[PDB]
Coordinates of C-alpha atoms and ligand atoms in Angstrom, one line a residue:
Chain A
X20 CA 0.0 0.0 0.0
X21 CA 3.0 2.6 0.7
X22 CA 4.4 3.6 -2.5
X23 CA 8.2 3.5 -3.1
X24 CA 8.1 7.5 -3.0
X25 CA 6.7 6.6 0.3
X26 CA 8.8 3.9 1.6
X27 CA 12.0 6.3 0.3
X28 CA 10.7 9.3 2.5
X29 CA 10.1 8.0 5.8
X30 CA 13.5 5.3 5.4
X31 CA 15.1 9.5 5.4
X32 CA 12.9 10.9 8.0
X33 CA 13.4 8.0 10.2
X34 CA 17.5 7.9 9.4
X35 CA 17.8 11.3 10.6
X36 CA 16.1 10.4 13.5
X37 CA 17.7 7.2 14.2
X38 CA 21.2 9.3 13.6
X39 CA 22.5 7.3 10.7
X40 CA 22.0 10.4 8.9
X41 CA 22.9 13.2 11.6
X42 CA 21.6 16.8 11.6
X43 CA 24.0 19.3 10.8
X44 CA 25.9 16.7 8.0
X45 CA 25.4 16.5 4.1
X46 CA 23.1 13.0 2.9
X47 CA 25.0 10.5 0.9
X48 CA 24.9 11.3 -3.1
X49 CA 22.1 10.3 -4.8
X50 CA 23.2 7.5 -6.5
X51 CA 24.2 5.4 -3.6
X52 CA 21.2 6.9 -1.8
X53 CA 19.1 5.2 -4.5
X54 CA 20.4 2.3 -4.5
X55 CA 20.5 2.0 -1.0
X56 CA 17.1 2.9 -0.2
X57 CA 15.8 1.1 -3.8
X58 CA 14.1 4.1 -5.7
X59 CA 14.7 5.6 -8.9
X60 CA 16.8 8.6 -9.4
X61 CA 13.6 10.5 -10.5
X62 CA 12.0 8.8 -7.6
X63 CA 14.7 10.4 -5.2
X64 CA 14.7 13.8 -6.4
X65 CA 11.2 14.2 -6.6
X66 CA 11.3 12.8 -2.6
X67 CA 14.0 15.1 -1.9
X68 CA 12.1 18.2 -3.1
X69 CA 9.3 17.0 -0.4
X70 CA 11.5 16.8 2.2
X71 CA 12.8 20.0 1.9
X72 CA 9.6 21.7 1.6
X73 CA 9.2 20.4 5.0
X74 CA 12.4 21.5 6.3
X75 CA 14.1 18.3 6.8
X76 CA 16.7 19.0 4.3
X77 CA 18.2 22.2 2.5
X78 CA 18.9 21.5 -1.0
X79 CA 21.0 23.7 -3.6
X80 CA 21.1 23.4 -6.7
X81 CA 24.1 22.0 -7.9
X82 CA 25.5 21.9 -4.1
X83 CA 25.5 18.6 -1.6
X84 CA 22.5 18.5 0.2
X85 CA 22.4 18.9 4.2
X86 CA 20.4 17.2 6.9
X87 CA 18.5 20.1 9.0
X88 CA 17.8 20.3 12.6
X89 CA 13.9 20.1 11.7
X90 CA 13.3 22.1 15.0
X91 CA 14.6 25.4 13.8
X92 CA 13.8 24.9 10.0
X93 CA 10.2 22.7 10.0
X94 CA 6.4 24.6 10.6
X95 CA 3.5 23.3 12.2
X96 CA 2.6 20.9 9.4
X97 CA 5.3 18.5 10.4
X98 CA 3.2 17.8 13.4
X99 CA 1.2 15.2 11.7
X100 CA 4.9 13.4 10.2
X101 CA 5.7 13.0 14.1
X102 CA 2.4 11.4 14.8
X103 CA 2.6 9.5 11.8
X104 CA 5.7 8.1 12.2
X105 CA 6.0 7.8 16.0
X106 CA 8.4 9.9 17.4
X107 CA 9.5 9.6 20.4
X108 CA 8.6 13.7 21.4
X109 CA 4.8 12.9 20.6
X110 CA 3.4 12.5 24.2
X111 CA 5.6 15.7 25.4
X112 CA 4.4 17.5 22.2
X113 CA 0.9 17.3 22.7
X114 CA 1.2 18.5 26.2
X115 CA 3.1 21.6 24.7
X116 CA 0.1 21.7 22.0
X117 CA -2.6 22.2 24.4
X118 CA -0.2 24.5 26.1
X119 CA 0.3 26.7 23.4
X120 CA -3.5 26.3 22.5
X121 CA -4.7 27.5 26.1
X122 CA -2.6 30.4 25.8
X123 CA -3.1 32.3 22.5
X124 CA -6.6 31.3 22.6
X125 CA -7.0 33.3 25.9
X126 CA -5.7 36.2 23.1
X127 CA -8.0 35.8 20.4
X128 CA -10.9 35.0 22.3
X129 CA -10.5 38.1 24.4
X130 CA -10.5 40.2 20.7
X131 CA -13.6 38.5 19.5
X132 CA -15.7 39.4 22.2
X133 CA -14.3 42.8 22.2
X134 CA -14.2 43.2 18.2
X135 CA -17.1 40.9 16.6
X136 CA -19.1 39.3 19.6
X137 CA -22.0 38.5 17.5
X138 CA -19.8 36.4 15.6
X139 CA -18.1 35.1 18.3
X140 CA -21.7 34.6 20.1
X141 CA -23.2 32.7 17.1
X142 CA -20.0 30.4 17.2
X143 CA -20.8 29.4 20.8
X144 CA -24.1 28.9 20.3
X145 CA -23.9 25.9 17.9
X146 CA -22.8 24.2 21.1
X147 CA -26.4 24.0 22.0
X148 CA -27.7 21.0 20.4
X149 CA -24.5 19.0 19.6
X150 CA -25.0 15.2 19.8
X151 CA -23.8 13.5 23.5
X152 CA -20.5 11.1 21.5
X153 CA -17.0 11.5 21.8
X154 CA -17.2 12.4 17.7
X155 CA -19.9 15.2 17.7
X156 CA -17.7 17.0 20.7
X157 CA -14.3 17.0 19.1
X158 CA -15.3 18.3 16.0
X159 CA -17.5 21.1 17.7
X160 CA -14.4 22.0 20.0
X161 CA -12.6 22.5 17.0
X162 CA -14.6 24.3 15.2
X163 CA -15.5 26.7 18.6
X164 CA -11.8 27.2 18.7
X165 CA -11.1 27.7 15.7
X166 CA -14.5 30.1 15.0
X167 CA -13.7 32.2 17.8
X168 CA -10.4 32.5 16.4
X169 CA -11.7 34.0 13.0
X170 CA -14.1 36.1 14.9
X171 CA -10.5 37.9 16.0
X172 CA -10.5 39.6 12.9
X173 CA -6.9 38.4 12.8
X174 CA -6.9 35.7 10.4
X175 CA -3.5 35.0 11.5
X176 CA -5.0 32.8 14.2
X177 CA -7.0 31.1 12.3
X178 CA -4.2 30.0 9.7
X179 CA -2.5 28.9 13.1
X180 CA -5.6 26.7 13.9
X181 CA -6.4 25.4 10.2
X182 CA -3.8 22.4 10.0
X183 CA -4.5 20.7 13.1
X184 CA -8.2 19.9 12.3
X185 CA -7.1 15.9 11.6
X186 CA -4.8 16.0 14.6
X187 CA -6.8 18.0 16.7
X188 CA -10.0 15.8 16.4
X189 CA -8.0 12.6 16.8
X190 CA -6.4 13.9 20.3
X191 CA -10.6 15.5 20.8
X192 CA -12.0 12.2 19.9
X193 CA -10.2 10.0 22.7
X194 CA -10.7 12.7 24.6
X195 CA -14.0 13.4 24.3
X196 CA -15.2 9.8 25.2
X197 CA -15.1 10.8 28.6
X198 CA -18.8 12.2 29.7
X199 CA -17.1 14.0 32.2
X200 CA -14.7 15.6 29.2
X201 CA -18.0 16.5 27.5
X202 CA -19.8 17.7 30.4
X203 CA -16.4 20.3 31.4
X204 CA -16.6 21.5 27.7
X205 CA -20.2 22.3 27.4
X206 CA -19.5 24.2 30.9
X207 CA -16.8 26.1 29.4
X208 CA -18.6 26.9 26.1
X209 CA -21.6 28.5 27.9
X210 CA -19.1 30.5 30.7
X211 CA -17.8 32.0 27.7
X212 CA -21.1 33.1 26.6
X213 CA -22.0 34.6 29.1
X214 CA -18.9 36.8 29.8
X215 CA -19.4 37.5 25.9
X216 CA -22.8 38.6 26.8
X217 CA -21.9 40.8 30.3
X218 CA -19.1 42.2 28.0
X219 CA -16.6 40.9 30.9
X220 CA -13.4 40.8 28.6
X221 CA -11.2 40.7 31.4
X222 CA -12.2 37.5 33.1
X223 CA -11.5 35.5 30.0
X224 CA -8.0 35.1 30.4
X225 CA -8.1 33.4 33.3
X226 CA -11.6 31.6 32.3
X227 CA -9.9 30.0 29.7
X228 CA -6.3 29.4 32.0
X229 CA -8.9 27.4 34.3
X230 CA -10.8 25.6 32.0
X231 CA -6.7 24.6 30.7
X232 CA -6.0 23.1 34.2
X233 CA -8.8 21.2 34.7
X234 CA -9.3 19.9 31.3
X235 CA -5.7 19.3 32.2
X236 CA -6.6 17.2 34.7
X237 CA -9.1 15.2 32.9
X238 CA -7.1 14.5 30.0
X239 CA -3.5 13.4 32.2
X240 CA -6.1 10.5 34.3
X241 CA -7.1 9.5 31.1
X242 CA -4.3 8.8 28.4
Chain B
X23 CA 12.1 32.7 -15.8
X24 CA 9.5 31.3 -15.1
X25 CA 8.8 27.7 -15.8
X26 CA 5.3 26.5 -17.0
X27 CA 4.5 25.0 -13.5
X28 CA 5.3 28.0 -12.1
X29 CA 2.9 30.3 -14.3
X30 CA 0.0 27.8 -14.4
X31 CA 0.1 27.7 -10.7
X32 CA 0.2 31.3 -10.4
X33 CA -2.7 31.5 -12.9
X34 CA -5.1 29.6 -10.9
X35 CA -4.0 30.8 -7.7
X36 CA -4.8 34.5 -9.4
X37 CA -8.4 33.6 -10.9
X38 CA -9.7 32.6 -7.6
X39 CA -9.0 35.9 -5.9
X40 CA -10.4 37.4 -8.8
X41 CA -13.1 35.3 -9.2
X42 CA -12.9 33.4 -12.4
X43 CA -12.4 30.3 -9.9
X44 CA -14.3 31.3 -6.8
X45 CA -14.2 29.6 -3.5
X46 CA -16.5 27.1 -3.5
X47 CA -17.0 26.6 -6.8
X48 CA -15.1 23.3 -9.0
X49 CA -12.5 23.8 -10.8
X50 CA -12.7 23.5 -14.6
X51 CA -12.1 19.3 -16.1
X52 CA -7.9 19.3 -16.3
X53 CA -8.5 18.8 -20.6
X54 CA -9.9 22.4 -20.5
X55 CA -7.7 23.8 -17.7
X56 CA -4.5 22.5 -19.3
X57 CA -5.9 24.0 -22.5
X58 CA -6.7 27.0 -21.4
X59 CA -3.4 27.9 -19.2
X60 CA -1.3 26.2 -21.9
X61 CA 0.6 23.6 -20.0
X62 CA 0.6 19.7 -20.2
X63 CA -1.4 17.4 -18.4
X64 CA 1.5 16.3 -16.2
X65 CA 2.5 19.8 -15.4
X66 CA -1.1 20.1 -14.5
X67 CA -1.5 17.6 -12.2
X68 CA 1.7 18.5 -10.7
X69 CA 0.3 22.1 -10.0
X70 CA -2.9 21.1 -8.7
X71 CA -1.1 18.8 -6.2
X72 CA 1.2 21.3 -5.2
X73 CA -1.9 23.9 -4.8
X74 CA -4.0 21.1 -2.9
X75 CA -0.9 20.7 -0.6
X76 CA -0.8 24.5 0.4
X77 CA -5.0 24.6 0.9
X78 CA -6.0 26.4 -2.1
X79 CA -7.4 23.1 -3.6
X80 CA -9.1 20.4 -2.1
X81 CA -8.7 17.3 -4.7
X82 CA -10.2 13.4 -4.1
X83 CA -9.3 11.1 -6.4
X84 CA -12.0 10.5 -9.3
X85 CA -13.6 13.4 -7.8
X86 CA -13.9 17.1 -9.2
X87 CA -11.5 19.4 -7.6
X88 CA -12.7 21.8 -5.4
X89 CA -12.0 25.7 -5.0
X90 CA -11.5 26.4 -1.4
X91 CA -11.0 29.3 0.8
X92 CA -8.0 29.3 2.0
X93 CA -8.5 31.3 4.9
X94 CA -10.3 28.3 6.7
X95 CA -7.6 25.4 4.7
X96 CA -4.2 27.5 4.1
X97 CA -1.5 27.2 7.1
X98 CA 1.1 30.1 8.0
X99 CA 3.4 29.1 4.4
X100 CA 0.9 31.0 2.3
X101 CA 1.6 34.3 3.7
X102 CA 4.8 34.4 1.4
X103 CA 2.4 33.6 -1.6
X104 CA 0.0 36.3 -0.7
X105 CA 3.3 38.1 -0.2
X106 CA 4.8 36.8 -3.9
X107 CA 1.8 38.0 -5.8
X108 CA 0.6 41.4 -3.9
X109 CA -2.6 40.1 -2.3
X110 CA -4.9 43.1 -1.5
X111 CA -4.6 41.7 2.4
X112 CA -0.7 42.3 2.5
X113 CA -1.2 45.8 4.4
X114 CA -3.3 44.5 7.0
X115 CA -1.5 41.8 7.2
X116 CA 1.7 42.6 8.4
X117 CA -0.2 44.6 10.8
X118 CA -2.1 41.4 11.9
X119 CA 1.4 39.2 11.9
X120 CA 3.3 42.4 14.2
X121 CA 0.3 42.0 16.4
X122 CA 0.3 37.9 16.9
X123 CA 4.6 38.5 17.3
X124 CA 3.4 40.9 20.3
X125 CA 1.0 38.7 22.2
X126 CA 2.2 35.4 21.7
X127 CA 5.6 36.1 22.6
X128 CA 4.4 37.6 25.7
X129 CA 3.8 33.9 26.4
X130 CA 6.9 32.2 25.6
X131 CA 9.3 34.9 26.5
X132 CA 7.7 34.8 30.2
X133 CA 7.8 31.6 30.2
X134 CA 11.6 31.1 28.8
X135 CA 12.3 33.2 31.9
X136 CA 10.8 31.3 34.1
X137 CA 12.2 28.1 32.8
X138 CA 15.3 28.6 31.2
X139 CA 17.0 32.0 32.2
X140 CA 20.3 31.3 31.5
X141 CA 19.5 30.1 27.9
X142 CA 17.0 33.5 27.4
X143 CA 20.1 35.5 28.4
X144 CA 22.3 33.8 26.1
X145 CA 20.1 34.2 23.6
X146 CA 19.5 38.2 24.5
X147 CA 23.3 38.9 24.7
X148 CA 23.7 38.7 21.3
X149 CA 22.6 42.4 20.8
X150 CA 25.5 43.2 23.0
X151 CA 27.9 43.9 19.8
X152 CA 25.6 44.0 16.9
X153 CA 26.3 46.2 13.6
X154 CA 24.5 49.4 13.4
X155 CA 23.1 48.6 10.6
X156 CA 19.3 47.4 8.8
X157 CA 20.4 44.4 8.0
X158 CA 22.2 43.4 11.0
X159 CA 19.4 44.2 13.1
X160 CA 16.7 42.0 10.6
X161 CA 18.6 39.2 11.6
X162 CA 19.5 40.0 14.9
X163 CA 15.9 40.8 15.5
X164 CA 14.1 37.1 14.4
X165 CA 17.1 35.2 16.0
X166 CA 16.2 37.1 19.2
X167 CA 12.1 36.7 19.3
X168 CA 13.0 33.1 17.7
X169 CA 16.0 31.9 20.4
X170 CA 13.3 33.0 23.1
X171 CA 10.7 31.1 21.6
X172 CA 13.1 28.3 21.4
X173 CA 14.3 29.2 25.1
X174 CA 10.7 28.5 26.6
X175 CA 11.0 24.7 26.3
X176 CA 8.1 24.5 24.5
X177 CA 8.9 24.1 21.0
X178 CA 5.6 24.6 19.1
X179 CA 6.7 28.5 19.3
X180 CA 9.4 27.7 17.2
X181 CA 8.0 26.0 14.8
X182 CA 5.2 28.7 14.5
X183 CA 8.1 31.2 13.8
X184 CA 10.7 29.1 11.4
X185 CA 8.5 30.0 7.9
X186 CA 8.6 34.0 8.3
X187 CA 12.7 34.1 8.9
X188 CA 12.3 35.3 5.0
X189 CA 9.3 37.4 5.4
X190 CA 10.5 38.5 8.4
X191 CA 13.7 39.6 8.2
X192 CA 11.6 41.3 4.6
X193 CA 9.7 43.7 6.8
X194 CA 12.5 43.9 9.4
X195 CA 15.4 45.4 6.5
X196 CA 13.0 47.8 5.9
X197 CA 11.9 48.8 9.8
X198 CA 15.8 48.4 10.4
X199 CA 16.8 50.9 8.2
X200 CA 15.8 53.5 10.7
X201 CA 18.1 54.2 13.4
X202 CA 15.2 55.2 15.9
X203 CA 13.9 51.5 15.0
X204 CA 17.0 50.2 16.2
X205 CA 17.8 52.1 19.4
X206 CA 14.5 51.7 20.7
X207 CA 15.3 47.6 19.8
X208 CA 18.1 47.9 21.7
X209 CA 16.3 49.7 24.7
X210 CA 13.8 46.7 24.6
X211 CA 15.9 43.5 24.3
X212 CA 18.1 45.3 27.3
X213 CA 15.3 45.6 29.5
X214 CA 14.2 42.2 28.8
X215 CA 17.6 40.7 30.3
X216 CA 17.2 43.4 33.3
X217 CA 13.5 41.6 33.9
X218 CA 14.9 38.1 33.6
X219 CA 18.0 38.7 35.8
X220 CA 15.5 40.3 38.0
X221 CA 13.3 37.3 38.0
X222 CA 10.9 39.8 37.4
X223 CA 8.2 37.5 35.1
X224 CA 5.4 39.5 35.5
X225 CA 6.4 42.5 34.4
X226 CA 7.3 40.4 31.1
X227 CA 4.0 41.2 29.4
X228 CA 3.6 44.8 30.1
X229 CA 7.1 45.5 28.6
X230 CA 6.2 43.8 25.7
X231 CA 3.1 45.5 25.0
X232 CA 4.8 48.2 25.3
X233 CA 7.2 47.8 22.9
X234 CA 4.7 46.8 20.7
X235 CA 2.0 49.8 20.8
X236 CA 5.8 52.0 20.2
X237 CA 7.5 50.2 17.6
X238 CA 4.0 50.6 16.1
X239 CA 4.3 54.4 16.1
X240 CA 8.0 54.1 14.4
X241 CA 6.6 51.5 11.8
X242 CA 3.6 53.2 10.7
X243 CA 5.4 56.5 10.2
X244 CA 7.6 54.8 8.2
X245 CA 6.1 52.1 5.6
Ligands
LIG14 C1 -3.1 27.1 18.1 C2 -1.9 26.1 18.0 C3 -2.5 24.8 17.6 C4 -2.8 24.0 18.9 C5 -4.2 23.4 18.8 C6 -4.2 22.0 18.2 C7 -4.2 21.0 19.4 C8 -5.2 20.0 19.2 C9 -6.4 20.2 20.2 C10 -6.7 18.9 20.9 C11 -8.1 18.5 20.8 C12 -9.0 19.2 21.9 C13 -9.4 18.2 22.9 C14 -9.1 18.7 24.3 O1 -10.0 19.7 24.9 S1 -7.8 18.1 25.3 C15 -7.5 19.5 26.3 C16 -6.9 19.0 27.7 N1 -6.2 20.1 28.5 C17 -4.9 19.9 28.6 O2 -4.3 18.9 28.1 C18 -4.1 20.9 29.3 C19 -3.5 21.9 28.4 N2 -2.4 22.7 29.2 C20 -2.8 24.0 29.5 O3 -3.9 24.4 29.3 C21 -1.7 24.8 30.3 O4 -0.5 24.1 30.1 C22 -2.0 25.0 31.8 C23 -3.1 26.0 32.1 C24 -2.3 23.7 32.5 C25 -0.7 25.6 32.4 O5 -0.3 26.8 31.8 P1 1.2 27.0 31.1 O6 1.3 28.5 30.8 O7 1.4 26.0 30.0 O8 2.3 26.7 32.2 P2 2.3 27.3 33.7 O9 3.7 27.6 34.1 O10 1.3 28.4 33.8 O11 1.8 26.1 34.6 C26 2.5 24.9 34.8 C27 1.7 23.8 35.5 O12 0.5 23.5 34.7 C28 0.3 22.0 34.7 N3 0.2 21.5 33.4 C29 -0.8 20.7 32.9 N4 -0.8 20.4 31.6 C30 0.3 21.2 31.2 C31 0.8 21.4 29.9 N5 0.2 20.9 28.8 N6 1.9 22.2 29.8 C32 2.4 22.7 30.9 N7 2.0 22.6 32.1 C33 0.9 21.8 32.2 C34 1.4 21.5 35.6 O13 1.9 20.1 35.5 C35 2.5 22.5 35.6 O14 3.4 22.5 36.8 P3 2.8 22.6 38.3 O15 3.7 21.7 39.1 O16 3.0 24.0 38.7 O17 1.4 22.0 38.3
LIG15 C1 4.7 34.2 15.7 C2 3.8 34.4 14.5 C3 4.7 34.9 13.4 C4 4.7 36.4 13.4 C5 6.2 36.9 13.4 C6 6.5 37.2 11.9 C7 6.4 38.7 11.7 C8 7.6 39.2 11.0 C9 8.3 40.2 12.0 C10 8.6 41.5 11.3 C11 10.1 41.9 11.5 C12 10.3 42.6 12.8 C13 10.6 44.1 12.5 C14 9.8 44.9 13.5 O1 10.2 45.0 14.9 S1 8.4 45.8 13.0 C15 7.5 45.8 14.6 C16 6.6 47.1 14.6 N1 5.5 47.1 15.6 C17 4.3 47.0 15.1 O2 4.1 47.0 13.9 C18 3.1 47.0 16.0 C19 2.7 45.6 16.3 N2 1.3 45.6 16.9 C20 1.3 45.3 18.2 O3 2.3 45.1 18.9 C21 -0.1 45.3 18.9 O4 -1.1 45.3 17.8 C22 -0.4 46.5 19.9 C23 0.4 46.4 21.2 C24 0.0 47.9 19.2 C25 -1.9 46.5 20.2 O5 -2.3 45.2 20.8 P1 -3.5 44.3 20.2 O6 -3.8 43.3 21.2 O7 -3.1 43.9 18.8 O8 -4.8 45.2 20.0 P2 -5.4 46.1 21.2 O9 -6.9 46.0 21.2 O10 -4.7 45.7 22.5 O11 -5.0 47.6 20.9 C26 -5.5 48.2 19.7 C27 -4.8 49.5 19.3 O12 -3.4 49.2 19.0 C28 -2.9 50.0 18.0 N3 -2.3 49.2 17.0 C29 -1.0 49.5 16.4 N4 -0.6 48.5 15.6 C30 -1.6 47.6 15.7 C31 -1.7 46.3 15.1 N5 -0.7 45.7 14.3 N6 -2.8 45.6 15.3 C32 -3.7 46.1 16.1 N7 -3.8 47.3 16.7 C33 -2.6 48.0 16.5 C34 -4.1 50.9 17.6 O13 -4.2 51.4 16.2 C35 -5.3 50.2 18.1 O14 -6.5 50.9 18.3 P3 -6.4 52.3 19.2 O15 -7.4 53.3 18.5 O16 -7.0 51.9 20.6 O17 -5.0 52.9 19.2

């Protein structure tokens, strides 16, 4: 089912990783690294340009090609390669994720009630007749999140927010099998209603902080 | 200069912010759309993939292609196409990204002082004997917000900043270039290491605000 393209780019990914390709030194010339990782030359450049694109290598024309340190050279997108292939910063990672998520989402929320609250009001209120399943409350989550972060008016949150969907909804769906995950949500949907509504854009902050902890809470018990 | 790829892929990308492809809408059969960019059917599959990859496309297998908007599919990566080709939103945008650098790095300079000081003043020192020059400061500027970022321990910061080091250090030659720009640069990274070898944390986001609201002043004045 995996296509040699495929099968060439993770043997890479996973070689950097596993250190037989180091970060910081050049990948063997093409020719041997076809025929040691059996792919075409066409195949191997073509997998090449993909990798670099994702920052895990820089390529020059004409020059040898290096192995990056994809930490200070990959985006956000590289997130789902990780989960894909297993690393070993995954657990950490999406600790750091829900981190980063608490955190600017106490900024953008604060701006939407403040700059569009009927927006941000009518993104709230789809929570009121969403489906009691794990499924239904992941992808409302997301799409509260990610709704209140285009009701910003900064659509630089929301291009923040617009990869994750798969990966946010996968962590959302084991989450969200918990009743008592579902019940803290809707809780935390409709408090932010209502300080929407009584125009209380300074108790969102650490609204939102709380709702982090014990969300927190919920999701460490479970795992 | 431009390859055939390249101009079909700026083509379509142009006709859906003009509307000959709007979002939302199917694109054209590939027969007609190679035929009417004047490219091969290769190339064209090639540049629809490319576009699907960066959200601009949404493409099934055996399925028409779809026109999205990429404000709800695009990631960070396409502000250097909106860049590229002179999107109407550019303005705002910058405005928009300056804002996001503000409040989000409230958050992970804080918390690189809480966590790793030592690192955070390593990474501020390096303004200590920096050229007085645009340039110098550009790069001085993204290593700074980008080695704090890095410095919090929570690496999803850096990976949010690694694709604007071009853009960035773009808008930062030209804010540079004023020496008012840089001394008050030099006033603010300074007070940041006063703050963190003064374990003073909270002051962290005021300071940065700060900053923000006056390097607004010397930016707009400027453009
Ligand atoms: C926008 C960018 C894209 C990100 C969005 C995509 C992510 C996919 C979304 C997943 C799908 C949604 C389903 C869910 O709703 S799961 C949500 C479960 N909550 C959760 O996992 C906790 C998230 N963490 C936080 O919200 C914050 O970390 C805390 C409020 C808990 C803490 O704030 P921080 O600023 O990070 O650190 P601080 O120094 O204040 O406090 C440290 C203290 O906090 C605890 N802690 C718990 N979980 C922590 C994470 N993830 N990071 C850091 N600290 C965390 C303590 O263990 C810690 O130390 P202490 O000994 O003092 O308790
Ligand atoms: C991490 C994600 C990737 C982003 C990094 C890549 C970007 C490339 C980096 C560019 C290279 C660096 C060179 C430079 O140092 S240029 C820096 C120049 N500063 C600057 O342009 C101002 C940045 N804006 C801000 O810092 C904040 O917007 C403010 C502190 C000014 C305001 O805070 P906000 O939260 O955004 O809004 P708030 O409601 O509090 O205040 C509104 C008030 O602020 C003014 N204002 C000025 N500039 C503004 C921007 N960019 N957005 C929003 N408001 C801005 C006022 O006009 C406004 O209304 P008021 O009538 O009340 O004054």
């Amino acid at each position: 089912a995996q296509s040699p393209a495929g099968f060439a780019e993770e043997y890479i990914i996973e070689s950097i990783w596993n250190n037989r390709f180091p970060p910081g030194t050049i990948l063997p010339a093409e020719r041997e690294l076809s025929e040691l990782i059996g792919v075409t030359r066409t195949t191997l450049r073509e997998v090449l340009q993909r990798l670099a694109r994702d920052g895990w290598l820089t390529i020059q024309h004409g020059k040898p090609t290096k192995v990056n340190n994809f930490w200070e050279t990959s985006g956000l997108n590289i997130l789902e390669t990780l989960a894909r292939l297993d690393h070993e910063s995954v657990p950490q990672l999406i600790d750091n994720l829900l981190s980063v998520r608490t955190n600017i989402s106490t900024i953008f929320i604060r701006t939407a009630f403040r700059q569009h609250p009927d927006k941000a009001q009518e993104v709230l209120a789809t929570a009121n007749e969403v489906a009691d399943h794990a499924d239904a409350f992941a992808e409302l989550d997301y799409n509260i999140f990610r709704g209140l972060a285009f009701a910003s008016g900064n659509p630089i949150y929301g291009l923040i927010l617009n990869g994750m969907k798969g990966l946010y909804t996968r962590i959302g769906r084991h989450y969200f099998a918990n009743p008592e995950a579902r019940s803290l949500a809707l809780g935390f949907y409709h408090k932010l209603s209502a300080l929407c509504s009584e125009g209380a854009h300074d108790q969102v902050y650490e609204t939102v902080r709380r709702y982090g902890h014990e969300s927190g809470e919920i999701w460490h018990r479970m795992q």
